[PDB]
Structures are given as structure tokens and as C-alpha cells.
């Protein structure tokens, strides 16, 4: 077909034009801008708590907005809300499907969400209407496994699925209000902007897309990774984000410059990144790895600052408290560790 | 600070209740063998078992089995297959009557090879079901389809001396069966160390002994892992 041939020709011409436009803005690199900045030094965090009680491996955790409570999901079919200060378990929610792959805590603290190989995102009412915790709403639109979910607020949640789509939900109606399409592979993670007006998603096509929540369209597409992107997180400023992929590298992309700023990799690292997160100031990039450690990276320089080596199996999730007080890591050894 | 002490006491009581429930949950979890039923759409696994994932529970010799069949998922598996690293066994169902009808047998071989060599699945055993034995037998007896057309090594392949065939079986049917089985076992033994094992099984889509085969294979897997914990094997 000549129509398909000329459409592909136009697409590659547009890609070349975009590449030229991005190249013209690369007057200098971030590495040489922050060359005179003093190094962060050596970061040595100790394990302060070890949360035990999960029977199987843990895929997801999410810190509460109060920086004290967190929720974790394990393949045994359990959601546990922990009191990280006292290591006491607050709730232990049995799941209808044991193949959970993600969990989200609501910013208000009234709800938790989970999903997985069953394509349903389940919302749980934490606050005691009568005393117990039960399923509040099930969202069954997706045709693939649920990989990530994040509450915009109460009654709004964004979910990424293996059907290569992201969706925006209304909890009371249970219906999708917006569908975000354009990824050609499984969407593995999403991160909400601080203002909750935009969110980025990393997929198995080695691409990250910046979406508009209100308009439901892809504003920008970021490339540069070589394998499936497993993790994504905004810089605390909101004008940048970091990704972690199976190609054993972490990359920092700038929204306004519309390109890559820095790559975080070492020759001794040949395993993929499963989770990334920033510190409170964004100076440190924390990445979990297929090998059982976590690496602390300088954000403004491409040099490692410290290592979190406490886990006996794959590190599957990590997160930093809203106040930056501590970082928690989940792992396939069925333990959560609080680092400080 | 008495209010703080009361809150701590209440939190401790709630934690104690949660741990007491978790003990029973752990006891239930350890006494159940989870199984991942995997195969092609026309491999016959739909009759064998007779929503993102389907679930069926069957009890054999008072032992609980929990077998999961993957439903509404895309054909890309490299991400959600990692959820079954700690499963007791992966039941792989292959249509033996597909060496020509789209080389489906080669696709099944590639899928098995990918499962075998995956880093997160390098400790999970595979119960292999070479299904549709009657259809393969009738196709071999008919002679219309030649296996050597799509597997050139079949011409120079001889039935193994340890092969035990059924009484009323054509030697050609037995040779084809064991050729497919050895095609799978070549991948199984190429890099399959003592961590995980393969259990070939010439089965029909409707066999009353399939649950017995699964039970025996799971018992063997558990016994082997126990013996390896003691470094006896």
C-alpha cells in the first residue's frame, strides 16, 4: 500500500524534525552544569524497622500522606496497613484475588486500592462505617492486568494496565471517565504530578508519555531507554521525572527541555531497575534493583552515593515519605524495611 | 501521657488479633499447592480444566490444590509470568497434533524454552502434558502429514530402549510420541539443573488420571525440595 508507505514516511520525517528540534536545545549537558557543585559525599542509611507478617513476595507499597502509615500488597492475598513508628499492624485485608500487583493509599487516608492479574481495581473503605474493612467499589473496565494505581483524591483514581492503556475512574459511578491510549506495550507504572494535573507513564515500549488528566491526551513522549520501563517518578519540582528500565540504567528527563538530562548507570550493574524515587529535595535518586540492593544516586551528578543492602530477594518497590523522613523498601523475601 | 499508653495498648491488641488471624492464614497457605495452567488456545487445556484469571480448586487424597488459568490477558507474557515464580508447578499443555497445523509445536517449544531459562522461573518445576495423543496417533497412521517436513531430525531418530508403549500402538505412533517428548526434554536437560524438573506425560484431553498425574508430580517436587534442603540429593 502506497498510503501506508507515505504515512510511515511522514511519521519518520516528523520524528527527524523532533530529534533536530531537541538537538538544537542541547547547548550544554547537566553533567557539566553541576560540575562545580560539591559532592553529596557518602550516604549511609541503616535499617530502622523490619515489617514482618507477609507470607509471599511483595509487589507494591505506598506511604501515607502522614508519613507514618503505609500499605503493602503481597501475593498471599493480603493487604496490610502498617504503623511504621511502632511496627504494629493496623489492618489486614484479605483479597478476593491473591494475584495483586499494585496498591495505592488515598491521600485522605480513608481508602486503599489494589489490583493485579484480575483486571479489577478494588477500593477498600478503611474508615469504620461499622467497624470492619470491606470492598467499597470494583472497577472492571480494563482488559489487562492492573500494574499501578494512584488516587487523585477521593472519588478519582488513575490506573495503568497491561492492555497498553491508562484510565481515569469515577469511584461512585465505577465508570471510566477518560482513557489514555498511545502506548504500544504494557504500562508498568505511573506517577502523578504534585498538582495532579499531569501524570507520566512508563511502558514496555521503552517510552514514557506525559498525559493531561483533564484533556485526556498525550502531551509529550520521551525516549532513550533501551528496554521495558518498570518505574517512573516526578522530580519534586514537577518539571522533570526519572525512569528505571530493564536495561540496567536510570534516566532523568526534563519536561520543558523535552529530552534526557542524565543517565545513572555503572559497569557493575547489569540488572534491571524495579522501582525509583526521589528524596524530599530531589538531590538523591533511590532505585531498587533485580539484585537484592538499592542504589542511592546523586541527582545532579552521575555518581553513586550509597547502597541499601538489606534484602535477601528482589527489591520490588520503594517509596520516600512525604516529609522525606525515611525510605521504605519492599522485597520478594516478604519483608519491608525502613531506612534512615 | 495516659492517653498515649491507652492508644498503644489498643494498637497492640489489634496487632495481636491480626497476627492470630495471620497464623491461621499461614497454616491454610502452606497446606495448598498452587498450580499455573499454561498452554495454547487450542492445546486442549480448556477440556482438561473441565476475568483476568480463572481459578479452580480440587482436592486429591485430602491434599488441597489451587490451579489458576490465565484468562483475559494479552499475548505478551514477560511481565505477568513473573507472578508465578513461587508456584508449586507450571502445568504446560501442548497439542501434540500440531506439528504441521502454523508450526504450533515449534511455538510451544519456544514458549517452554523461554519459561525454562527465565531467571525468576529457574526454581519452578514444569508438569508437561503432551495432549491430543489420539489425534496424533490417527494423523501418524493416516500418513498424510510428515513430521520430517517440519522437524528434519525425525528421519534419523530411533525410539529409545526405555520407551514403554501401550499394547495396541503402532511403532510409528510411539516413535512420534517419544520424538516430541525428547524434543521437549532436550530443552529441559540443556540447562535444567537440580533446582527444577520437567515431568513429561503423554495425555489425552479427557483422561481421568490427569489429576493423579498432577498429584504424583507435585508430591515428587515437594519430596525433592525437602531432600535438597537436607543436601541429600
Amino acid at each position, epitope marked *: 500500500q502506497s498510503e501506508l508507505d507515505q504515512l*510511515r514516511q511522514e511519521a519518520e520525517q516528523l*520524528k527527524n524534525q523532533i*530529534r533536530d528540534a531537541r538537538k538544537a536545545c542541547a547547548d550544554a549537558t547537566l553533567s557539566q552544569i553541576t560540575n562545580n557543585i560539591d559532592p553529596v559525599g557518602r550516604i549511609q542509611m541503616r535499617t530502622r524497622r523490619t515489617l514482618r507478617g507477609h507470607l509471599a513476595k511483595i509487589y507494591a507499597m505506598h506511604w501515607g500522606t502522614d508519613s507514618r502509615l503505609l500499605v503493602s500488597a503481597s501475593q498471599d492475598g493480603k493487604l496490610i496497613i502498617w504503623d511504621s513508628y511502632t511496627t504494629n499492624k493496623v489492618h489486614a485485608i484479605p483479597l478476593r484475588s491473591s494475584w495483586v500487583m499494585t496498591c495505592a493509599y488515598a491521600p485522605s487516608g480513608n481508602y486503599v486500592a489494589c489490583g493485579g492479574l484480575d483486571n479489577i481495581c478494588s477500593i477498600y473503605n478503611l474508615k469504620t462505617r461499622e467497624g470492619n474493612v470491606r470492598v467499597s467499589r470494583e472497577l472492571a473496565g480494563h482488559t489487562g492486568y492492573l500494574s499501578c494505581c494512584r488516587f487523585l483524591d477521593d472519588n478519582q483514581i488513575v490506573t495503568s494496565s497491561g492492555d*497498553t492503556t491508562c484510565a481515569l475512574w469515577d469511584i461512585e459511578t465505577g465508570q471510566q471517565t477518560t482513557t489514555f491510549t498511545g502506548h*504500544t*506495550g504494557d504500562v508498568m507504572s505511573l506517577s502523578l504530578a504534585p498538582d495532579t494535573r499531569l501524570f507520566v507513564s512508563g511502558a*514496555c*515500549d*521503552a517510552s514514557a508519555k506525559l498525559w493531561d488528566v483533564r484533556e485526556g491526551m498525550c502531551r509529550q513522549t520521551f*525516549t*532513550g531507554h*533501551e*528496554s*521495558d520501563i518498570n518505574a517512573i517518578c516526578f522530580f519534586p519540582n514537577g518539571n522533570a521525572f526519572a525512569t528505571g528500565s*530493564d*536495561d*540496567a540504567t536510570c534516566r532523568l528527563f526534563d519536561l520543558r527541555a523535552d529530552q534526557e538530562l542524565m543517565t545513572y548507570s555503572h559497569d557493575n550493574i*547489569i540488572c*534491571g531497575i524495579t522501582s525509583v524515587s526521589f528524596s524530599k529535595s530531589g538531590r538523591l535518586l533511590l532505585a531498587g534493583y533485580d539484585d537484592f540492593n538499592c542504589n542511592v544516586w546523586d541527582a545532579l551528578k552521575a555518581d553513586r552515593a550509597g547502597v541499601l543492602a538489606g534484602h535477601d530477594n528482589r527489591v520490588s518497590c520503594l517509596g520516600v515519605t512525604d516529609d522525606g523522613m525515611a525510605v521504605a523498601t519492599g522485597s520478594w523475601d516478604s519483608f519491608l524495611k525502613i531506612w534512615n | 501521657t495516659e492517653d498515649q499508653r491507652n492508644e498503644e495498648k489498643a494498637q497492640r491488641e489489634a496487632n495481636k488479633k491480626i497476627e492470630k488471624q495471620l497464623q491461621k492464614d499461614k497454616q491454610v497457605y502452606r497446606a495448598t499447592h498452587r498450580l499455573l495452567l499454561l498452554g495454547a488456545g487450542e492445546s486442549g487445556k480448556n477440556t482438561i480444566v473441565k476475568s483476568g484469571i480463572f481459578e479452580t480448586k480440587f482436592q486429591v487424597d485430602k491434599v488441597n490444590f489451587h490451579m489458576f488459568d490465565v484468562g483475559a490477558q*494479552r*499475548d*505478551e*507474557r*514477560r511481565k505477568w*509470568i513473573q507472578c508465578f515464580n513461587d508456584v508449586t508447578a507450571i502445568i504446560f499443555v501442548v497439542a501434540s497434533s500440531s506439528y504441521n497445523m*502454523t*508450526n504450533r509445536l*515449534q*511455538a510451544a517449544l*519456544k514458549l517452554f*524454552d*523461554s*519459561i*525454562w*531459562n*527465565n*531467571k525468576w522461573l529457574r526454581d519452578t518445576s514444569v508438569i508437561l502434558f503432551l495432549n491430543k495423543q489420539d489425534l496424533l496417533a490417527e494423523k501418524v497412521l493416516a500418513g498424510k502429514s510428515k513430521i520430517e*517436513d*517440519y*522437524f*528434519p*531430525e525425525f528421519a534419523r531418530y530411533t525410539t529409545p530402549e526405555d520407551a514403554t508403549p501401550e499394547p495396541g500402538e503402532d511403532p510409528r505412533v510411539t516413535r512420534a510420541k517419544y520424538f516430541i517428548r525428547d524434543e521437549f526434554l532436550r530443552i529441559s536437560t540443556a*540447562s535444567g539443573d537440580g533446582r527444577h524438573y520437567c515431568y513429561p506425560h503423554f495425555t489425552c484431553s479427557v483422561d481421568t488420571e490427569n489429576i493423579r498425574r498432577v498429584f504424583n508430580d507435585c508430591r515428587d517436587i515437594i519430596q525433592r525440595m525437602h531432600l535438597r534442603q537436607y543436601e541429600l540429593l
Partner: nanobody
Amino acid sequence: QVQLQESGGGLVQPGGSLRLSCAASGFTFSNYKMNWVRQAPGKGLEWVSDISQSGASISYTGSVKGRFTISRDNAKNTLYLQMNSLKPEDTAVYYCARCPAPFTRDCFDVTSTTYAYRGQGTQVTVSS
């Protein structure tokens, strides 16, 4: 941007010879295992051949064994497929597909209907 452009296909007589090349960019070529996948008209994607990172481990499908020769050049970031004895059943669109992850031995989803890390394809037609 991971790009794979394959060129070399075209009309060829039965028993003829064709050479398929695959120019790769956007990733470290030497770290990945390459594959060749074809789609016959009216049928699904069928795996053909693969070659390891160093090129010391080569596998073929039975239909083309002894006829096709896969080869890779890590310095030039190029993947090759030599065709020697073409048949009318060899008429298909041939795709240059890359394994999802580096340094791995398993190669999942390489023949998926909508699978990234695969080229647009080059048409090979065998007729008279």
C-alpha cells in the same frame, strides 16, 4: 529511540537466493539476542531463527534448517539472514525482532502480534 530497519527482500524465483539485512540503532547491539520472525499471508507470526549476543549459539526452525543462515556483526550493529533455497511457502513478511532484555537467555513475546522492538518488516515473495 529503538529503531530496527530491515532491507533486502523482494521478488525471487523458486530456488533463488536473497539476503536480508537489519540495521539497528538506539541500543547496545552486542548486549541483546536477535531473532528473525516471518508472517505468511493469512497466517500468524512464526519464529524462524535467532542468534546469541556473541553469535556462538544459533537456532533455526525446522522448515528452514540447512537453508537459512543468520549472522550478526556487533561492530556494525547489523543483523543478517542469508536465504539459499527459496520455496513458494517461504513467501512472507520477515521481521527483525530483538529480545526484550539484555544479558538474558529467555526471549519472551518475540512473535507477539503487537510487540515492540520489532522492525516494520521486509517483503519476500517467491513465485514465477
